[PDB]
Structures are given as structure tokens and as C-alpha cells.
């Protein structure tokens, strides 16, 4: 559903983009490659 | 306490255009909007972000509805394209200080109500 640097978010049912995570202290598993580089 | 104004609401027909906008007392990191139709739970609708200003949407509205904020004028604005008689619902607008939004956000605005007939 969502693009490559995206994740889906059960609760909100958006796909969110992962830069909103790199800041966070756990970004999502399929964010990590793009929030810091692969 | 962040305090959130609403404004905008009303009856629209079917494939009509609306405008809704909340005005926030302070800043934020997030910026956006919910909606609960009668007999449903409040549902997610759209958000953006402060820096950078990142646009996020339910998947429901996607490529119907907008969203933009003025961080200066502390506004949130959300743009209805293609209404459909199931858009009607009470919009919340809601500010959170957060990197998302969240569905238990810090603050919410009072609701506008949006109708959309057929």
C-alpha cells in the first residue's frame, strides 16, 4: 500500500513517511534503511 | 493547554468542495484532522507535519482531500474534493506533540459538522 521510504500505520490506516521516525527512538523495522541509510 | 477553534463545516451535495480550518493557540509538531460518523468510532483523517511539512492521509481520502497548514498563523486547513454522502461526519481537529499523529493526540477542537447529501 505504501511507497518505498513509507509505512503503514494500523491505527491511523495512512501510510506515513519514515523521516517523521529517524528523530524517534524505534523507527519501524521497514523505515531503518532510509532513516540513516540501508 | 493548546486550545483548537474549528471552522467551516456545513451541507454540501455529493461531489462538492469544502474547506474546513482550525486555528491552534500555540505550535505543535503535528497538525490535523479526525472525523466520527454517527455509530462509528473517531477515525483518523489527515495530518502534516511542522519541519519539514509532510502530508499524511487515511486511506480513505486519499486523493480527495488535502491538507495544509500555516506554522506562522498556528492554522490548519483541510480541502474537500469529491465529497461523498459518507463524508458526513463530525471533523475534529486535533494538535499533537508528536513526530505523527496519534489517535490519542495531546489536544482536540470541539467539532464542526460536514453533510454531504445526495
Known amino acids: 500500500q505504501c511507497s518505498q521510504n513509507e509505512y503503514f500505520d494500523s491505527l491511523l490506516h495512512a501510510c506515513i513517511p519514515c523521516q517523521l521516525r529517524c528523530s524517534s527512538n524505534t523507527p519501524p523495522l521497514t523505515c531503518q534503511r532510509y532513516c540513516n541509510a540501508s | 493547554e493548546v486550545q483548537l477553534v474549528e471552522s467551516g463545516g456545513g451541507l454540501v451535495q455529493a461531489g462538492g468542495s469544502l474547506r474546513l480550518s482550525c486555528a491552534a493557540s500555540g505550535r505543535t509538531f503535528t497538525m490535523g484532522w479526525f472525523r466520527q460518523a454517527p455509530g462509528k468510532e473517531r477515525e483518523f483523517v489527515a495530518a502534516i507535519s511542522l519541519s519539514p511539512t509532510l502530508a499524511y492521509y487515511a486511506e480513505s481520502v486519499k486523493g480527495r482531500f488535502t491538507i495544509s497548514r500555516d506554522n506562522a498563523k498556528n492554522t490548519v486547513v483541510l480541502q474537500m474534493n469529491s465529497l461523498k454522502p459518507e463524508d458526513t461526519a463530525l471533523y475534529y481537529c486535533?494538535?499533537?506533540?508528536?513526530?505523527?499523529?496519534?489517535?490519542?493526540?495531546?489536544?482536540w477542537g470541539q467539532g464542526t459538522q460536514v453533510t454531504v447529501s445526495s
Open positions: 486535533a494538535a499533537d506533540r508528536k513526530s505523527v499523529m496519534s489517535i490519542r493526540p495531546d489536544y
